[PDB]
């Protein structure tokens, strides 16, 4: 019930019925079909078949897909055509869900930033800073001051998305009024996979160190968290909301480490003085029925 890392940490279980999330961003929509589905399936990165052989396992779960992108119509009919295919897959667009609660006008930070500097003795500002704080606040003339509209190329617009997604987590499905959601309650999370991340086995039942838990990728002797798999218990889970502050305040926060890896550094206050190996080990989203990090040993399906 209980574990420990700095103090006692309540390990939370998920109902199996707890939905898996898969998301693809697809910057060229083209270079696929316009009647088939706009999701990769190389030899080399086969993404559609995983996120399929995923939800043939966990049927009695849900399994979803998070997709944006100018796609043309038949594509939409193609994934259509997988809903009906397979209850089991609901797929998920960004224009349909609101993520206005989460966001913050680029204008706001900057200057909030500025001011803080900006009090402080000019010797112990930050001119460099200042000057690219100062810059950047002009160039927003354009009629667009949104941090979310700012994270739209291709690895910002679905890094901060897939962020969003999970701080929705459960509460997405039910957003989207994806139909054959009869499990699942509104303070129901997801659990993010990337679709290289091969579910050997149904995974059942879960347990995550304070209700949460994420993919470390450890190389050699250091351990790095990641944003590959994202476990959470209850949506808007604390940790994604203070790497969401860390975007609200931080200059050029990266969605990737800010957002999620540094977030949870504050959750459980790593204290730096603190072995990091551990506190990987203790939010390890540990899995053997799960093969993390295919492409690894094959391509990494982004050019950038
Ligand atoms: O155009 C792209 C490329 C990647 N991804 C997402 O990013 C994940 C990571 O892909 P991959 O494992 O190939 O990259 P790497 O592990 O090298 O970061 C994929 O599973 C997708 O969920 C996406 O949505 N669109
Ligand atoms: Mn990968």
Known sequence: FTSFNGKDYPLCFLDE???????????????????????????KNPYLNNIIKAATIEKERLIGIFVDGDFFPGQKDAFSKLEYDYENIKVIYRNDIDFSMYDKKLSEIYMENISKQESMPEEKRDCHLLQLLKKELSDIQEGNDSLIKSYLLGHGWFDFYRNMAML????????????????????????????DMIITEKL????????????????????????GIIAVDRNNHPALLAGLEIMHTKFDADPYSD?????????????????????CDFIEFKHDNIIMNTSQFTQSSWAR
């Open 259 to 279: 957002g999620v890896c540094n977030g949870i550094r504050k959750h459980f206050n790593y204290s730096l003085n603190e072995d990091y190996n551990s506190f």
């Open 168 to 195: 929705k987590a459960g509460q997405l499905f039910l957003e989207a009024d994806k139909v054959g959601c009869y499990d699942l309650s509104t303070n129901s999370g997801c659990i993010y996979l990337d679709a």
């Open 204 to 227: 059942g039942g879960i347990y995550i160190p304070d209700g949460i838990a994420v993919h470390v990728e450890r190389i050699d002797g250091r351990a790095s968290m990641e944003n």
């Open 17 to 43: 019925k707890t939905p898996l999330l898969f998301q693809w961003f697809e910057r060229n929509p083209a270079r696929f079909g316009k009647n088939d589905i706009p999701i990769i399936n190389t030899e």
